[PDB]
Every structure is written in structure tokens, then in C-alpha cells.
């Protein structure tokens, strides 16, 4: 079984490339590993502006390798004030029993919106009480992945399948209960799952 | 972890529906099972001619369920003299968890789903019609029948035919593929049959044309 080094990747727009480490954790049989890039619509794109190499590769048992993610000149065609979403894809082909694949989000982040250290831009989310839920607003230049909404801090962490991903400078309507003091849980850049407290004022709520 | 009851499925053209069994082998956490159909080029298709019900479903810990495959009346547009290739897809979606050993990303898979029209319905071994014609730097495998034949190994002996790791070569009905390989005095070929088995065949070559 081929393992990836992470569950989500931020592509620093400052760099022209970056690598991901993979490894065949089977200490006996060898595995193939196909890699490819998709756009936000999940459609395979082969001419860039982000490409994966090598496309396919053999991993001897217990071996460790990598995949390279480089950009092409038309990388400047993508917006430079917001992130763009791609999906890094990976399929492991077992030797002679079915192939398994995974896709992780690949967040291309232009150098202009490179975040400052210890920066928490998720403070800018705005909650709007709607009919049976919230019209959540993300004014930031980044995709924010919400994983739980609660009435208490620990209640924002017990949801099972409450995952909602917002686009930069957008709004979504999420079906939800109406809490007095909503607490939002989210995934950060490294995989942390911090919680935010909101104080509502009428229909509109903020941190 | 959602599991399928088979590595490949054959859709019988005479039937209207057919079910695949899926189980949640995790006896502690609930999972969503996303199912969908793709055509021969691996593009999702929602308007038929084959559909999967339901698209999404919650499988409680250790639960067992099923996905239904069925045809829409536009199934009649497909050729009745050969098989048609579809892919059944399954994506398992994990709940949020803090357990270190639980993967927090969705995994997926697709098995081949061969539509077999009522006319070409079959213990019959149609892979016997396979012909091997010697050519430069290998052979030209010809598939005279109306079915798909998956070739997973080609060698000098029965064991060298099962020594193949990743050399799969799938043959469209009534097609032919040239495979680069060594010239063998007695070529053995291994293929996947409908049930998932892996038989091996023995070829007798009379000049440049070889047959079972």
C-alpha cells in the first residue's frame, strides 16, 4: 500500500516546484504508483499549469520515493489575489486484489497572498443566520475547510460528516441548527483542527 | 473500510437489475459509500444506460449493504453482438476522528463492469479462440470473440505465465494487440475469467500462427 506524506498540500507560489514523499509500506511485494493532477472540477489535465512526475513508477517493497509538482509559464494566468484548487491524485497498482486511489486537495497559493507567521485568517469568517442554518461568508483569499459547527467548543468537534469547504471570497448556505454561540471547527494548513468562537448580533455573527 | 464482493462484475443483458454487496469491515466507525458509473473512457455517466442506486449511503459500524445496478431503456442503443465496457466506482468517506490509525481521507476504487447482451450469453471457455501470431519483437494477440479478454501474463512455461506482475493487456471484442515479448517455442498465456480466476493456456505454434 503506497502512503502519502500528507492529507492536503499548499503549493507555495513563490517556488516553481515542490515534492511529496511516498513509500511502499509492504515489506514483501512491490507496487506501482500512478500520479496525476486534476482541476477543481476533478477533470484530468495533462498540459499544466501544474504537472506531476513521474506519471507512473515502480516501488520495490519497503522503498521510499517521491513525486514532483512543477509549474509551467501559464501559472501566471491563474488569479494572483486568491488561491486556485487542484487535486493531486495517487493510485497504487498491486502486483499479481484491486487498485486503490486517493486524491488530496492541492491549494495553489500565489506569492502575493503568502501568509504571515502564526496568521489566523479564519477570524474573518462571518456567520449569517438563515432559515434552518447559516449563510457562511469567507472574505479571505483562501479556501477554508469547516469540519464542525456546535453550540459549545466540544460540540464543534463531535460532528461525523459535517465537512463543508468554502471558496475564497464566497458564501455557502449550510443546513444547521441555530446555536446561541456558534463554535466553528476547521482544518488549518498543517492539519491542525482549532475552534473559533462567535458572538452573534442579530442574524450576523462574527469572531 | 468499505469492501466490494468482487474484483470485476459481469452485467447479464437478460436481467433488469443486479446487486453488489458492500460491507463496512470497521466494527467501530460509520462510513459513507459513494457509488457511480463511468463509461469506457472513465467519464462519469448519470443518464444511463447503466445506473447505480443509491449514489450515497451511511454504513453504520460493521454494517453490510448493497448497491443496485440497473438499466434505463436506452440500453437498447448498445451493440448486441459484442460486450460494452463500463466501470463501477466506489468511494469510502470517513467520519472525523482523532484516532491516529484511522485515515482521514476518502479512498476509492473502480472494478470493470462488462455489459453482456442476451445474445452472447454463455462453463464455456471463449478465451480458447485466442490466436497468437509471431511478429517482430513479440506477438500479435488477436481476439476473434465478442468478449473482452484480460491477458495478465505471457511466458515460456506455466509458471513463467504466472510470474507476471503488472503486464496486463485488455483486448476489446474483435480486436488485436501487439505485445513486446520474447519468442517462445511453447508460449503460455494467463488470463482473468469472469469469476476472478486466473487460468493458463498452452499454445501450439504451426509456423507463424499459434492456437490452443
Swiss-Prot record, chain A:
An individual GO BP term: chaperone-mediated protein folding
Pfam families to which the protein is assigned, alphabetical: PapD_C, PapD_N
Keywords, sorted A to Z: Chaperone, Disulfide bond, Fimbrium biogenesis, Immunoglobulin domain, Periplasm, Signal
Top-level lineage group: Bacteria
Major place of residence: periplasm
InterPro entries on file: Ig-like_fold (IPR013783), PapD-like_sf (IPR008962), Periplasmic_pilus_chap (IPR050643), Pili_assmbl_chap_C_dom_sf (IPR036316), Pili_assmbl_chaperone_bac (IPR001829), Pili_assmbl_chaperone_C (IPR016148), Pili_assmbl_chaperone_CS (IPR018046), Pili_assmbl_chaperone_N (IPR016147)
Transmembrane keyword on record: no
Intrachain S-S bonds: 200-205
A GO term from the CC aspect: outer membrane-bounded periplasmic space
Cellular compartment(s): Periplasm
Entry keyword annotation includes Chaperone: yes
PROSITE patterns listed in its UniProt record: PILI_CHAPERONE
Task of the protein: Binds and caps interactive surfaces on P pilus subunits to prevent them from participating in non-productive interactions. Facilitates the import of P pilus subunits into the periplasm, probably also facilitates their folding. Chaperone-subunit complexes are then targeted to the PapC outer membrane usher where the chaperone must uncap from the subunits. Coexpression of this chaperone with individual, otherwise toxic, P pilus subunits (tested with PapA, PapE and PapG) suppresses their growth inhibitory phenotype.
Similarity comment: Belongs to the periplasmic pilus chaperone family.
Other remarks in the entry: PapD donates its G1 beta strand to complete the Ig fold of PapK (donor strand complementation).
Self-association and partners: Interacts with substrates PapG and PapK.
PANTHER family: FIMBRIAL CHAPARONE PROTEIN, PILUS ASSEMBLY CHAPERONE
Name this protein carries in UniProt: Chaperone protein PapD
Amino acid at each position: 500500500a503506497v502512503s502519502l506524506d500528507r492529507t492536503a498540500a499548499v503549493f507555495d507560489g513563490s517556488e516553481k516546484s515542490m515534492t511529496l514523499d511516498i513509500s511502499n509500506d509492504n515489506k514483501q511485494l512491490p507496487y506501482l504508483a500512478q500520479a496525476w493532477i486534476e482541476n477543481e472540477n476533478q477533470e484530468k489535465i495533462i498540459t499544466g499549469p501544474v504537472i506531476a512526475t513521474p506519471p507512473v513508477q515502480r516501488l520495490d517493497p519497503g522503498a521510499k520515493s517521491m513525486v514532483r509538482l512543477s509549474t509551467t509559464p501559464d501559472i501566471s494566468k491563474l488569479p494572483q489575489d486568491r488561491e486556485s484548487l487542484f487535486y493531486f491524485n495517487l493510485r497504487e497498482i498491486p502486483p499479481r486484489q484491486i487498485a486503490l486511489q486517493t486524491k488530496i486537495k492541492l491549494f495553489y497559493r500565489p506569492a502575493a497572498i503568502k501568509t504571515r507567521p502564526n496568521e489566523v485568517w479564519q477570524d474573518q469568517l462571518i456567520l449569517n443566520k438563515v432559515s434552518g442554518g447559516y449563510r457562511i461568508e469567507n472574505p479571505t483569499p483562501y479556501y477554508v475547510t469547516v469540519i464542525g459547527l456546535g453550540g459549545s467548543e466540544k460540540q464543534a468537534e463531535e460532528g461525523e460528516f459535517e465537512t463543508v469547504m468554502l471558496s475564497p471570497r464566497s458564501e455557502q448556505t449550510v443546513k444547521s441548527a441555530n446555536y446561541n454561540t456558534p463554535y466553528l471547527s476547521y482544518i488549518n494548513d498543517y492539519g491542525g483542527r482549532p475552534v473559533l468562537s462567535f458572538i452573534c448580533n442579530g442574524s450576523r455573527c462574527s469572531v
